[PDB]
Amino acid sequence: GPMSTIGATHNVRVVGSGRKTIVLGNGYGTDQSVWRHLVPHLVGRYKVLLYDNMGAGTTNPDYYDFDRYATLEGFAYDLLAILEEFNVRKCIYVGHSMAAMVGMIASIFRPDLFHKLITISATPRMSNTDDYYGGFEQEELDQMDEGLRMNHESMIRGMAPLVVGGDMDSEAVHEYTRMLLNMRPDIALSLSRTLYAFDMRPFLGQVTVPCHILQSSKDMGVPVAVAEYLHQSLGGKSIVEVMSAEGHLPHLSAPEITIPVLLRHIQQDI
Amino acid sequence: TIGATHNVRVVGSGRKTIVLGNGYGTDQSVWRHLVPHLVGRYKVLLYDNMGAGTTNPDYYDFDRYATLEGFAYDLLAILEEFNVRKCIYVGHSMAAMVGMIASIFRPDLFHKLITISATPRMSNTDDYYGGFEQEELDQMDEGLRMNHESMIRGMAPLVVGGDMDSEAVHEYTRMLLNMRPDIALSLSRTLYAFDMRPFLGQVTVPCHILQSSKDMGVPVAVAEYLHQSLGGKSIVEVMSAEGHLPHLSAPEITIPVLLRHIQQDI
């Protein structure tokens, strides 16, 4: 009855101390160590909750429920369950990419739990349509999927430097490559396919909590125009900041620039 | 993989490394008020003992963990895997006894031990006060066995003590309720019959013995017994904080005491 395994299965960690709580959600294929340059600057004034989304290399693959996670709201249910279990009444939610969209969905189901959302490299939809520019044609996504299934390790070793950007053999490229490779390949494929088909656009007007939209000046997964799209479509308050840093994972690869941006948007309200 | 199994996390920087060991049924978030005061000066290693609600119960090896001896192996294995030569070790309750067991094999690894709510034997004998008669430990065992969740919901606020209906009481209740009941029963019975006394004399590493007032599990006399019995240097500080988990429930008192003893050796 009262026994919850969600803290063990999702590697939930509460650190820091303070009146307000910050929750950090990881993007595709990453684990919470991606936040290790941010957390030191939060713990003096904030409680911080870290966790890994189901299917990460740091999590047990036997617990990945394919039907649950076939579409993204399954991860939103996990987030709400973590907030319930750890008695998080209200939080500042920072989410990278996938986790930005998960926090959006969760904030629609339960706006009371979210003081605001802060997004990094968020896109509501990857593939272009006749009236929307996501940065990918569907044929590109299909070819990317074909490369991933045909030779999973080679695809990952090659894509990780391009996604991180600005210099392979950077430490961040190595960590990202390692987290991607530590995923079980069938889970990596399934979640990739979920993200290829995800479409937040119809739902964006339902978001009412304030959103701080941050993104890099050059992100191979997210054209900067998509950040402006979100700003025009969200149902509540929002602000966009394009950072000088490049890359899909700037909190990992450009913390010297990104952490100060993040802190500014944590403190200040729109 | 022992790093992943025990949720080992390393943070901070400096010549000293501080290792924090958690008490029964408790995970490393109990140290969350202390760690931000440490990382500007020290490297800090946090981990969870097997059986904690944050660990996978499938990996609780009952034969391995049948005596407190089994948790020191884990500690040393963790200390080796993360390349920690010499640590300052802060252990709460059972972890104080573990770091002490572990210091007996390996003095070289511990610059000193700091203990919170440490006790070498819970049950009274004729020449010793531990705070509990054997019948009391018997009733507590039977209470856990007969209704796990009811036992915990009642005992957790008692054990935390101090201020009532606190954030600390909720977290302690939550972590105890997340243990698998057979593990909780197993580990509790070990702690109920454990006896460290014949080994204290071989504890030669210096030990800072910090004791809350009004700790339902450790009378104040036990801190003085440990002070008398350890083989090396020791000092006792009785704290004004109340309760069994003052690092969790009274950090505003306990953290400055901890910082003082981390920095001042004697």
Residue numbers in the entry:
A (entry chain A): -1 to 268
B (entry chain B): 3 to 268
Recite the paper's sentences.
Many parasitic Orobanchaceae have evolved a large clade of diversified KAI2 proteins (KAI2d) as receptors for exogenous strigolactones. We present the genome of Castilleja foliolosa, which reveals an abundance of KAI2d paralogs that act as strigolactone receptors. Castilleja foliolosa’s KAI2d proteins include high-turnover enzymes, in particular KAI2d15, which features a substrate binding pocket with a methionine cluster at its entrance that is involved in the trade-off between substrate turnover and affinity. In summary, our research reveals that Castilleja possesses a large clade of KAI2d proteins, acting as strigolactone receptors, participating in activating a parasitic state in the plant.
To obtain additional insight into the strigolactone perception in Castilleja, we solved the crystal structure of KAI2d15 at a resolution of 1.8 Å. As expected, the protein adopted a canonical α/β hydrolase architecture, with a 4-helix lid domain covering the substrate binding pocket containing a Ser/His/Asp catalytic triad at its base. The substrate binding pocket was quite voluminous, measuring 908 Å3, which surpassed the 861 Å3 found in the strigolactone receptor KAI2d4 from Orobanche minor, but was smaller than the 1111 Å3 detected in the highly sensitive SL receptor HTL7 from Striga hermonthica. We found 3 methionine residues in the crystal structure of KAI2d15 that surround the entrance to the protein’s substrate binding pocket, including an alternative side-chain conformation of M142. To study the effect of these methionine residues on the receptor’s substrate specificity and sensitivity, we created a protein variant, replacing the three methionines with valines (KAI2d15 M142V M153V M157V). The mutant protein showed destabilization at lower ligand concentrations when GR24 or 5-deoxystrigol were present, while the wild-type protein destabilized at lower concentrations of strigol or orobanchol. We specifically compared Michaelis-Menten parameters between the KAI2d15 wild type and the mutant, in which three of the methionines at the substrate pocket entrance had been replaced with valines (KAI2d15 M142V M153V M157V). While the turnover numbers (kcat) of these proteins showed no significant difference, we found a 3-fold decrease in the Michaelis constant (KM) for wild-type KAI2d15 as compared to the mutant version (0.8 μM in wild-type KAI2 vs. 2.4 μM in KAI2d15 M142V M153V M157V). We observed a linear trade-off between these two catalytic parameters in all investigated KAI2 proteins, except KAI2d15, and remarkably, the trade-off was restored in the KAI2d15 M142V M153V M157V mutant. Thus, a possible dual role of the methionines in both enhancing substrate binding and promoting product release might be the molecular basis for KAI2d15 mitigating the typical trade-off observed in enzyme kinetics.
